[PDB]
Amino acid sequence: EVKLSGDARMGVMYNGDDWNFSSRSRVLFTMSGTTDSGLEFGASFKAHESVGAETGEDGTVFLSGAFGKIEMGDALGASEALFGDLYEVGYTDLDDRGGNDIPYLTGDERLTAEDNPVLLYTYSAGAFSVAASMSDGKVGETSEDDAQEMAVAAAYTFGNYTVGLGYEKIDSPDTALMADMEQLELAAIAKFGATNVKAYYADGELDRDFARAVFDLTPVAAAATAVDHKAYGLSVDSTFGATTVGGYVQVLDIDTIDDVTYYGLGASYDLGGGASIVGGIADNDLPNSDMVADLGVKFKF
Amino acid sequence: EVKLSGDARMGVMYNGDDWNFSSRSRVLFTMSGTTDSGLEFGASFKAHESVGAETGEDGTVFLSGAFGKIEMGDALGASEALFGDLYEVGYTDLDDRGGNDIPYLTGDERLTAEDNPVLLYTYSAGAFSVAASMSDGKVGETSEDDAQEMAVAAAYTFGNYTVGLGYEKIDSPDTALMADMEQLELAAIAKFGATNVKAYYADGELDRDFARAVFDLTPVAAAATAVDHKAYGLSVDSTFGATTVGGYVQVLDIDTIDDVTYYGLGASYDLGGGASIVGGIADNDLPNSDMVADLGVKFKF
Amino acid sequence: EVKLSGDARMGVMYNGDDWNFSSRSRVLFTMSGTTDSGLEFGASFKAHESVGAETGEDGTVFLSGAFGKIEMGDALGASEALFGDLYEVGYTDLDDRGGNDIPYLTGDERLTAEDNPVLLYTYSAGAFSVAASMSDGKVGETSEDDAQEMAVAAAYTFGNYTVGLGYEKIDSPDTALMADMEQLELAAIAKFGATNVKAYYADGELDRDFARAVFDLTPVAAAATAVDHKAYGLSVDSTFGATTVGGYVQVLDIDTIDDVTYYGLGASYDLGGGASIVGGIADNDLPNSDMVADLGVKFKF
Ligand SMILES: CCCCCCCCOCCOCCOCCOCCO
Ligand SMILES: CCCCCCCCOCCOCCOCCOCCO
Ligand SMILES: CCCCCCCCOCCOCCOCCOCCO
């Protein structure tokens, strides 16, 4: 069975200097089935991904059961599968100055995307959850000696709160050229009525020149070094009636290289029916940074 | 909600010299919704446009209400939104020698396409209609100082006839390189039973070397000059029973550069059910021009 | 009317040296309609082919009736339309070492693919079938003097068996550069309960350097020569309960150039519901050849 859903948005966006019209529409194909013993299986991808979904680069395929779910394709990484990301600000998701996303190292469309189809395993039992993920250590089916990437996370919900932790590791095929990167994450999610609060603290080590490239700095002509980093952040959103207001603030401090605090503030008004007016503002504290902002309508079909 | 429709055609086509098989199939995704106060909203794009529809280059998004409809994306331009184009000849739309389309300067996939998402506003009240359109004056969200393009049109239906007028203007970012282009259009549409008659007269001014490029002439190594042009044409089609016969003739006279009359004659036979046999013939009076022609079946699903 | 179906698979694949995750998902658009006298017409293409299906390179359009079916697009060639191919081994279709496909010269995505939309005509009456196919002798609608390719096949079912024959011919536009290629095929299909047996014998002549390129050999700096070849093979599959086991073996002997025998063995277990576990092994006898193999699940929606 194949079900269709879709979305669209339109409005105006300020990129720091000019306003521009911004719009889009997408269509999602969700396919499902149950085997005779009650195993579930399915697949989904958006229409603009038809081509990569046909090679396993985009879209995901899965099979679940009493043993947990195995998913393959552009599967999220284990930590991000359990904890997700922060309040999404702006109708276009105002990612320009850093975004609402938690800086997960692996999985998805993140640092490991070249590796795809990656595999995600997840399993819950009552109030606990575990997730583990990895590439094959080759570039999909072309047996390329590469990035072996992997992650593990686990959570525990106790009433109102989930708290969890995860570990992500990216192995370098030539550490004289690229240090291995690793990160440890702790996250705590709390819902109190119409308010959601999500907070995280991650720490680990990054390859020097990847870290210098994050902040847009030329690399240094030397062998690879690992620098230490710690990241952390918070979003709060609440809904009153049909109005949600929310924001987030996060910091990345990569030691010996630079520090940035980035943030955003947004609001939505639900017109009911699948449409809402959404608008937002995000920025960070580095040097250049010019706020971006937007305002428009978002539609779910 | 997401509805699917689609089309397909197949037959043989004569390009001036040889016959070739010609065929295609397309699928259109139409998505709709109503908000709690009865505002309508939607989005649509064809499957082969999944990629550009995801950036706002292809497909359109809209929101309508008592105030009129706002549409954003590859929106038609205001004049073309009210008056449309002439009898479509041939199963492949025999556009080779000039086509059935009225030479609108803006909107759509026309001279302004780079500008997209462009915006179209339309509003009717009883028997009158207004439409206005424009780009943002940037290249979508990449704030590129460019083509500010805009148009306005209005119509009035009085029984059997609509008559209307429109104005289209394209501003040059460096008039020493490209003159501004403008056009004024008047159109009159009349339905008399099973006969439709559409006629227009447009006039204005074009950039010299754009006009020379239309007729496929090298440009002249000089600063930009505007040349004056006037365009006009007519189509008539009628249906008897299951057979429609129709044609059009149009002329473009760009002063000091060249004149062309182009035309076409076609017929359809409806097999009922969404299929019809369609065939046609088009040509113009320039020098080379070898008639193109075709014959095949067209299918709507 | 537009119906959606789709498929997906996931598992691990061994390419001769390494195992890799391999997965995909696809969506097929099938569109149909009946005219007032009961002619059927339709079109279909997969989502990842939206772009070529819009030019007639991918997907097919058709119109059938009492006269037979005419199909245009990426239509299969006449022989392959009647006889199909051998047991498909492996969840990814383990085509690496030669595959389960019978070496048809024309149609489809085979040697004639550049030619597409190609045309297929088929007609059955009781127990007999005929099929004929061809390109236009141009490169679709760009009138390119090329490959005129064509084929004819016919079959006869007598109870338990179909036996048939076909002829395929590819004409060279410069025989000093490329010999014409031709092939004659005989095939016999037999179903005995849950067992299917398919066998073929083809023979003809190939262009020398195409034949040398098949076996991956540099060509020889001389004018084109035709070499003679004969191909033949067999697959057997049977289902016991929910387990199907099957395999095939085929040989290509191109005279004065090289001989290869290629084969594969696979099995499926049906989980019911559209999912099955499939796995397989294929290889050939040339020199390098390292077996490929796979194991995973396949899903139909
Ligand atoms: C710890 C691994 C991080 C991996 C993902 C990168 C996280 C990026 O967000 C942090 C930085 O703030 C935004 C980027 O700063 C660069 C300049 O602004 C962009 C235009 O020049
Ligand atoms: C007034 C602005 C016009 C902007 C759109 C162009 C209108 C084109 O149709 C008129 C010309 O007739 C067809 C083209 O003539 C050129 C040569 O034929 C094509 C193959 O060489
Ligand atoms: C008679 C016309 C044949 C036209 C289609 C080609 C048939 C290919 O299958 C036969 C050969 O066996 C597989 C290929 O052998 C080449 C080397 O292996 C591949 C990796 O190097």
Provide the 8-state DSSP code for A291.
-
Residue nearest to atom 16 of ligand 1 (CA): A215
CB pairs under 8 A between B and C: 121
Number of residues that make up chain A: 301
CA distance A90 to A217: 28
CATH of the domain at C30: 2.40.160.10
Grouping H, G, I as helix, E, B as strand and the rest as coil, residue C112 is coil
**Cβ–Cβ contact B217 with C under 8 A:** no
Q: Count H helices and E strands in chain C, helices first.
A: 3, 16
Those residues with Cβ within 8 angstroms of residue A25's Cβ, 6 or more apart along the chain or in another chain:
A6, A7, A8, B31, B43, B44, B45, B53, B54, B59, B61, B73
Q: In C37-183, which residue ranges form alpha helices assigned H by DSSP?
A: 50-53, 78-83
How far apart (Å, rounded) are the C-alpha atoms in residues A135 and B232? Answer: 63
DSSP lists the bridge partners of residue C135 as none
Experimental technique for the deposited model: X-ray
Query: Containing H/E element for C211?
Result: helix C208-214
Count up the domains in chain C and report the number: 1
Q: Is the CB of A252 under 6 A from ligand 1?
A: yes
Disruptive mutation site among A3, A7, A10, A276 for chain B (greatest number of B CBs within 10 Å) = A10
Domain residue limits at C63? 1-301
Smallest Cα distance from C156 to chain A, Å = 37
Tokens for A97, please give them.
Answer: 């100055």
What whole-number distance in Å separates Cα of residue C62 and Cα of residue C70?
5
Residue B168: partners with Cβ closer than 8 Å, 6 or more residues away: B77, B78, B79, B104, B105, B106, B149, B150, B151, B182, B183, B184, B185, B204
* Residue in this structure with the two tokens 């159109």, named with its chain if needed: B187
Give, in degrees to the nearest 5, the angle at Cα C79 between C73 and C82.
90
- Separation of alpha carbons B297 and B300, rounded Å: 10
- Report how far residue A15's alpha carbon sits from residue A10's, in angstroms, rounded to the nearest whole number: 15
CA distance C101 to C148: 23
Any ligand 1 atom below 6 A from CB of A214 = yes
Contacts of A222 (CB under 8 A, 6+ apart): none
Report yes or no: C178 and C219 within 8 Å, Cβ to Cβ: no
Tell me how crowded residue A51 is: count the other CB atoms within 10 A of its CB. Answer: 17
- Searching chain B, which residue's CA lies closest to the CA of residue A18? B143
Check if A119 contacts C (Cβ < 8 Å): yes
Task: Provide, as residue numbers in chain B, all residues whose Cβ is less than 8 Å from the Cβ of A9.
Answer: 61
Enter the tokens of residue C275: 């999912």
Beta bridge partners of B268: B244, B278
The CA-based angle B43-B49-B52, given to 5 degrees, is: 85
Q: Is B273 near chain C, with CB under 8 Å?
A: yes
Q: Does the CA dihedral A90-A94-A98-A104 come out positive or negative?
A: positive
State whether the beta carbon of A287 lies less than 6 angstroms from ligand 1.
no
CB contact under 8 Å between A23 and B73, yes or no, is yes
**Which ligand 2 atom lies nearest to the CA of residue B215?**
16
Nearest CB to A33 within list C9, C10, C301: C301
Q: SS3 string of A22-69?
A: EEEEEEEEEEEEECCCCCEEEEEEEHHHHHHHCCCCCCEEEEEECCEE
Residue closest via CA to ligand 2's atom 15 equals B215
Whole-number Å distance between alpha carbons of B96 and C141: 12
Do A182 and A205 meet the contact criterion of CB atoms below 8 Å apart?
yes
> Residue C48: left (phi > 0), alpha (psi -120 to 50), or beta?
alpha
